[PDB]
């Protein structure tokens, strides 16, 4: 190869336009049916240790 290089500086517009897909999507969160805390679905509740209606973890 022969060390390809940028031909022009990228403009403020084009660089920010490239970044139009970089926003975060927020965490998907449900209420724990026992302590009502928000938590990721399909995870053992980290607030009270309940999952599928029973205590699985000390917390």
């Amino acid at each position: 190869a022969k060390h390809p290089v940028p031909k022009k500086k990228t403009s403020k517009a084009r660089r920010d336009a490239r970044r139009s897909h970089h926003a975060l999507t927020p965490p998907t969160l449900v209420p724990c049916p026992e302590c009502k805390a928000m938590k990721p679905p399909h995870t053992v509740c980290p607030e009270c240790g309940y999952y599928a209606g029973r205590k699985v973890l000390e917390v």
């Binding site: 938590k39 399909h42 995870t43 053992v44 980290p46 999952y51 699985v56």
Partner: peptide, 10 residues
Amino acid sequence: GYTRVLKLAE
């Protein structure tokens, strides 16, 4: 089914 795997929160 002698084991089970439950995903953790954090």
